[PDB]
Design a protein around this nucleic acid. Sequence first.
RNA 1: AAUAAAAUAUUACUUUGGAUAGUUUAGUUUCCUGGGCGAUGAAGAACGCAAUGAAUUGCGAUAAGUGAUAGGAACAAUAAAAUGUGAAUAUCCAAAAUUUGAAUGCUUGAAAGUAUACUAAGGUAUAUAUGAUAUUCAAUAUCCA
RNA 2: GGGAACGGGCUUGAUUGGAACGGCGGGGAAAGAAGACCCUGUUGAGCUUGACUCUAAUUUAUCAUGUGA
RNA 3: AAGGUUCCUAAACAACAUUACUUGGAUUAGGGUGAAUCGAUCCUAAAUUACAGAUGGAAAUCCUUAAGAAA
RNA 4: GAUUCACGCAGUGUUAACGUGCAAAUUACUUGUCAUAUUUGAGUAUAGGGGCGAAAGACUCAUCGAACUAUCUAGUAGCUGG
RNA 5: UGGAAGUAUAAAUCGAAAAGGUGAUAGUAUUCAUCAAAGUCUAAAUAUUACAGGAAAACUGAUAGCAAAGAAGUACUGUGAA
RNA 6: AGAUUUGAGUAUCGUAAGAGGACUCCCUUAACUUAAGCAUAUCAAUAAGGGAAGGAAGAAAAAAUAACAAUGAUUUCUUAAGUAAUGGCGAAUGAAAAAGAAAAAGACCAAGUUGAUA
Lengths: 50, 54, 92, 72, 122
Amino acid sequence: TGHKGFSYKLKLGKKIHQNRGVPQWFRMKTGNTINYNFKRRHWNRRKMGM
Amino acid sequence: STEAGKQHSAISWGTGRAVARIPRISGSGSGRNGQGAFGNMTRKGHMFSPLKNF
Amino acid sequence: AVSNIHFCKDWRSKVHTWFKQPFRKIRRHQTRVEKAKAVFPATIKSLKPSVHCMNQRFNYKLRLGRGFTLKELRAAKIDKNLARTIGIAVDP
Amino acid sequence: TKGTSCRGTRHNKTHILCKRCGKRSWHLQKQRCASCGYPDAKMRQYAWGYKALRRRTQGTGRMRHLKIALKR
Amino acid sequence: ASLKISAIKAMSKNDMNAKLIELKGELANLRTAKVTGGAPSKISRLRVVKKDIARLLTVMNTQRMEALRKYYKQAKYVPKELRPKTTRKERRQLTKAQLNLKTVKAAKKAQHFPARKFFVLA
RNA sequence: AAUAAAAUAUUACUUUGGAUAGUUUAGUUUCCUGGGCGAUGAAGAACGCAAUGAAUUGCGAUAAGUGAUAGGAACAAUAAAAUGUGAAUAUCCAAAAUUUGAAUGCUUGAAAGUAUACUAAGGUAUAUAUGAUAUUCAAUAUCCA
RNA sequence: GGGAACGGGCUUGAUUGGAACGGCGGGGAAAGAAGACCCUGUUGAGCUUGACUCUAAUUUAUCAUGUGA
RNA sequence: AAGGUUCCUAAACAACAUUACUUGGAUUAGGGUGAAUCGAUCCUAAAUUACAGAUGGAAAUCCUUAAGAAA
RNA sequence: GAUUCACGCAGUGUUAACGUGCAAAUUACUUGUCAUAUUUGAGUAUAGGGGCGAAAGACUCAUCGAACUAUCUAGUAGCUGG
RNA sequence: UGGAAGUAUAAAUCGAAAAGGUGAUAGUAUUCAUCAAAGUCUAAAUAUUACAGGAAAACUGAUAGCAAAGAAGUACUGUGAA
RNA sequence: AGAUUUGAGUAUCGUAAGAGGACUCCCUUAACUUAAGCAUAUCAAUAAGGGAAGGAAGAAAAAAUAACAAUGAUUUCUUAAGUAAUGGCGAAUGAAAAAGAAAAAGACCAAGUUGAUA
């Protein structure tokens, strides 16, 4: 909604922050298996239930 | 483990659904739901009479 | 033969296994050994009387009891207050 | 009209996030949390919910002030 | 990390805070340099000063707390921050003296009929 | 009567798939020792902090870490700086420890907040029941002037 | 024809060139569903009733010591 | 209300939008939401929940001004 | 609590379309209705031998002649399959 | 409850003592035997599949062994319990 | 006015709460199942619900056994023993003294006495 509580917006903002991928330099570490962020979602693909 | 394989809340779907009567996992959202259950012929269920430490 | 098995109750939670029996022997022995090291007559197992068994079935067999009566200490001229301190059991 | 059509009016929340367990389990009209048993002081735990016990209990978190105490 | 503990420890109470004012101001301008496209040398200076602020504060608090403990060492009523470290259970248990208390009748018997040493000839 | 496009059959090589073989920083059971939380704020939840991090890990406005004591030359994906005048690393230690949570000044929905007292801001105290002491009271409740 | 008494396979015959396109609805006792009609289980559930055994509510008698006739 | 960055710009089209796409509500990276006067905050409506009290073997239930040296 | 038309709403008929559908109940025309026993948003109250029902055993999150979910529970099967 | 004319607990009524309880077939009487209720504390020998730290194994060897040998109670589903 | 009794507010110093419950002590009148049906019985101090603690907890020093050439607090193991007994005497349920061991330890209140009473 346009109207939201202060705490609800900050938890909304964190969900934006966590919708990112692995930085390129992290993928170049030795013995690295983390290439994708499997905790990723899109607004039209999955609702985050909050 | 005495609880191995039997850690589910599964019940059989019955007849009339073109699937066997083996118990099936409950819920949705994962590939595990609707799959086989406790029975010893299934996957991830208990075995035949499980080994006891006594 | 007519079978009489009381397994209809949940016996699987009633099962007690003796896997600690070999380690119980080592634990008890290491306590007797370490008790004498404190003071050797601590484990002296203070003296006990020679009492008969009960019933006519065992009445002819003598066995250890606990503690001498106050008449037995007086007959042997032993203070009943000092008896407990010199490894003598007393049973008033 | 009990299937596809009746779902169109679902835009009113029943549960929102709870303050003690952080889950969207705080019932707005009942004023209690279905998961962690809010304002009730004792945490809501049941023996039939053995899986619910191994999801949120001691040792499932940071253990900020108890990891040192047991290590000490 | 270039501040050194020896330089900090020799500073006065006012020189403690006077340095901290500059260190906070130095880092405040370094945060701007990161935003406005600063050199990696300036970035490496940002990380150093942050530990200097932490190092400076640690000495400031430790020195005052040590003085506070010397203040209340003789005090009958001590604040909970200076009492001996114990668990909640320990502060509830009886002391060793109280656990070993004996009645006068029982205490005098243990001195008149103690556990004598002996042995038995076999 | 006739051809082998299709169809069928075997072998070799390639393809889709991941069985089989080798392997294990993962589990299961038994046993030994303890069984050491919290109003001095626990367990749990939330938010935040790495030069470049989304998760995870560690940590709490002193932030992937501070001091002290042991420790002796590293780290690395790429740069920087600092470094035997002491780098990593370790700890039953010390300082510090955001919002909440039994949550406890009052309210709390996803709520932004807010009263008094003490030492503009900041920091403490103020929930309920309760044991002891001090103190101020109420009841002609028993006497008594 | 026989057969589990209505075969695509078996026996005897009629007959057959390999690959198929668009239709259509005879057959494949076509597909969908461990028959829902009927029966059998010493299998159930809703409902009814002076079916058997009980029970809440209702009701009645005794007990539980206010003083003086 | 619900959604939660889907809004704007630039680069870029492996996947997705039953063909295709230089397009995109899709990928990557930045940017963007300014209040003494608009609302929440304030008041009460249906209703709801506390201390003390009443009840209960128990968890807990009742009461919201009646029972209270409380409000 | 008159007769009708319109914005809307329903669901009488075609037993039309579709029936591995646009859709786990929808579409087209036709019909009925279209303000006082009216339509509707939000808040709030009522919960499983319970609730709510202008009463169809109807509705109670695609679940109802007794919801969903977890435990007893690997319930029992003289019956069926291997 | 094995306790059977009542082994134990509780409720309604009743209710002792110049003492008395028990000797399990109810009752009275006389002997005998053995204890002395209706208050409290008390180490040692015993249990343990929470959890933490270790050691072992005729245990499993990635459809096996815990659900989890990788950011596993994670991805994902439900209004929610789950 | 004074001596008391009871009940409150405030201040100071503390105490309870919550997590965990594998093992320990208890409250509650489940059912599936078995009896080839079923209604007492069995399942069964079992499941679920509720309360309380510790490193162990509970019990503990005879108003106890026994009828003997007698024993002697509590706890645990062997045996008695699937025995005595209980049960539509059906299905089923079911102890204890003796005897052998592990370990051993007994102390107080109230009541009574002493009161130039403390």
